[PDB]
Symmetry: C3
Subunit: 156 residues, 3 copies
Amino acid sequence: TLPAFGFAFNASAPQFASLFTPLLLPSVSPNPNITVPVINDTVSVGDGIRILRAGIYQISYTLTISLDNVPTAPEAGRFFLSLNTPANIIPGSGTAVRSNVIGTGEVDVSSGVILINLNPGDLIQIVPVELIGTVDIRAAALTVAQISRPHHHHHH
Amino acid sequence: TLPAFGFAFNASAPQFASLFTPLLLPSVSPNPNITVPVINDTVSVGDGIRILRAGIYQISYTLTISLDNVPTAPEAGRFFLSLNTPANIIPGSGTAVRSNVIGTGEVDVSSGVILINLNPGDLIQIVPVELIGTVDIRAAALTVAQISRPHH
Amino acid sequence: TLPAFGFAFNASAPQFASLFTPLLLPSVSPNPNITVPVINDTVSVGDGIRILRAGIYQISYTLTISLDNVPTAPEAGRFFLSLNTPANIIPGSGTAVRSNVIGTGEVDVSSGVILINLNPGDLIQIVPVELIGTVDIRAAALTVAQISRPHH
Ligand SMILES: [Au+]
Ligand SMILES: [Au+]
Ligand SMILES: [Au+]
Ligand SMILES: [Au+]
Ligand SMILES: [Au+]
Ligand SMILES: [Au+]
Ligand SMILES: [Au+]
Ligand SMILES: [Au+]
Ligand SMILES: [Au+]
Ligand SMILES: [Au+]
Ligand SMILES: [Au+]
Ligand SMILES: [Au+]
Ligand SMILES: [Au+]
Ligand SMILES: [Ca+2]
Ligand SMILES: [Mg+2]
Ligand SMILES: [Mg+2]
């Protein structure tokens, strides 16, 4: 039997960040040649990944932000991964972008890899928790993969 | 059997970086609702993770640093994962913050994922290897997960 | 019997970035104490990892760039993972360094972790897609690890 996993991403539909509003992740099919859903025993709900199987899971994400200091400066954001509800942020999952010294252009940020116990129905999402100016998100991607079955629970 | 793994983090207790001093990682329970230790056949020793089972592992870490160019400027830090001793740095595990490159404010960094053979008693730690100014670490997290039993 | 994996890296030989030129990754043994190739059912070809076994994989990379030397005023570099051909860039695999100051030392970037269905003969490489000024790459590492046998 296969590990549970999913990969949901945006590489085509820019979005403006909004405080505690999960980022839109409309695609699950990253292979440009053999284009198939990279999903097993998870569900992509358009703005995140829902867990169906209890277990220990690695979760992580990336964003691309277009920085131009327009219409206002500076343009800055802080993002986390959330469990179930947007304010329910997960430690270790911070990313941050600021236009103050980098200047202009697309900037890419990547979270670390968090290991966390998840249960059926758990919803993982990327949420902005602080914003200054208009944050133009040109790409985002959420990665969920099952490291192991529960290590203290028979079914959990 | 169950893959060996550990997640050791600090989200509660800011620390100043000191050269070749492992970062403090007091917590192992990241889920804010069902709070349980994310530890199987590893030990969280308080400033890193000790390997109890030989195998291939994926190792990675994160840091949050507060840059403000006070009391000295610029503020800069370079960090790497260490094996057993702080001088024994692991390739591909490097992170950096430089206030003259990225500007002041809170910055998050993340290492790549390192695939490495590890043996019982191996201690994985996050160490600063270069510090300019007083480097204020607001958060840190270390990730260790077995991907395979020893291939050879 | 064991998951397919490869770790190919450069900790030793600096290279200049060129547009759509895969980075050189000459080493497969990261453990400084017990130096063994971290390779199982993949091939390190010198500038990437070739897949031999169909499956779902996690792929990611890291680079270190030196802003020392490089007198050029603005320096910027954007990189992706490519599938088979350098122009065939994989979504979610972006990295970027953009500095308006030099002499600031080394800075590290890390991609996210992409989950992707790969087939035998597939070649994963790190490619520069945008370069402003001269980009001195002082280190690079590519991580390939199988997550699952094919699911459909
Ligand atoms: Au499983
Ligand atoms: Au987009
Ligand atoms: Au939906
Ligand atoms: Au559990
Ligand atoms: Au437990
Ligand atoms: Au195992
Ligand atoms: Au930077
Ligand atoms: Au902290
Ligand atoms: Au081995
Ligand atoms: Au190098
Ligand atoms: Au200048
Ligand atoms: Au500096
Ligand atoms: Au497939
Ligand atoms: Ca990363
Ligand atoms: Mg703008
Ligand atoms: Mg300060």
